[PDB]
Amino acid sequence: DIIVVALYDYEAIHHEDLSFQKGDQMVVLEESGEWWKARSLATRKEGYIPSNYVAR
Amino acid sequence: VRPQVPLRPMTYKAALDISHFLKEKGGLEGLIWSQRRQEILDDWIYHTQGYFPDWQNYTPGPGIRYPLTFGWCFKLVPVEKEVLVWRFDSKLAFHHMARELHPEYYKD
């Protein structure tokens, strides 16, 4: 219901974060804070993402 | 290219994971320490991962400098106004070496 598209490349260092590339689509699971838990549509990996790196 | 990521606090787990990633990537181990290089690393962590540069301090000299933030697993070792190199120690994951030597930093 909340689908977002990546605007920038992000490489995760912390194990509970989600890496992605410019243009990747993700579903947002949780929005508590400025780091949102999301899931990749391509890999179905889950993790937190920088909320300002994504749109819509 | 990448903008500034939202800020978050440093934890023991995050310090561990950043330590392990740097050991796996390569570059830090064996490198000669300099204030300029310490700033490049601290500011990189801050722009990419949103941890403020307040966790990468070591015990004052002389001798081996030990990390003040439990979870940071690099230590500064002198080699033969010193000259120091970064060195990973896995013992640092389980022994808070700074708290063992300087309890006053952590008593209150």
From Swiss-Prot, chain A:
PTM comment for this protein? Phosphorylated on several tyrosine residues. Autophosphorylated. Becomes rapidly phosphorylated upon activation of the immunoglobulin receptors FCGR1A and FCGR2A. Phosphorylation by the BCR-ABL fusion protein mediates activation of HCK. Ubiquitinated by CBL, leading to its degradation via the proteasome.
Q: What induces it?
A: Up-regulated during myeloid cell differentiation. The highest levels are detected in fully differentiated phagocytes. Up-regulated by IL2.
Tissue specificity, in the record's words, reads: Detected in monocytes and neutrophils (at protein level). Expressed predominantly in cells of the myeloid and B-lymphoid lineages. Highly expressed in granulocytes. Detected in tonsil.
Residues of the SH3 domain: 1-56
Question: What does its UniProt record remark on the domains?
Answer: The SH3 domain mediates binding to HIV-1 Nef.
- Known role: Non-receptor tyrosine-protein kinase found in hematopoietic cells that transmits signals from cell surface receptors and plays an important role in the regulation of innate immune responses, including neutrophil, monocyte, macrophage and mast cell functions, phagocytosis, cell survival and proliferation, cell adhesion and migration. Acts downstream of receptors that bind the Fc region of immunoglobulins, such as FCGR1A and FCGR2A, but also CSF3R, PLAUR, the receptors for IFNG, IL2, IL6 and IL8, and integrins, such as ITGB1 and ITGB2.
**What protein family does this chain belong to?**
Belongs to the protein kinase superfamily. Tyr protein kinase family. SRC subfamily.
Identify this protein by name: Tyrosine-protein kinase HCK
What is the organism field in this record?
A: Homo sapiens (Human)
Please name the taxonomic classification of the source: Eukaryota, Metazoa, Chordata, Craniata, Vertebrata
Swiss-Prot record, chain B:
Species for this entry:
Human immunodeficiency virus type 1 group M subtype B (isolate ARV2/SF2)
Motif annotated as PxxP, chain positions: 3-6
Q: Which residues of the full protein are shown?
A: 74 to 209 of 210
Region Mediates dimerization, Nef-PTE1 interaction: list its residue ranges. 39-55
Q: Where is this region: SH3-binding?
A: 1-9
Q: What is the protein name given in its UniProt record? A: C-terminal core protein
Where does the record place a coiled coil?
A: none
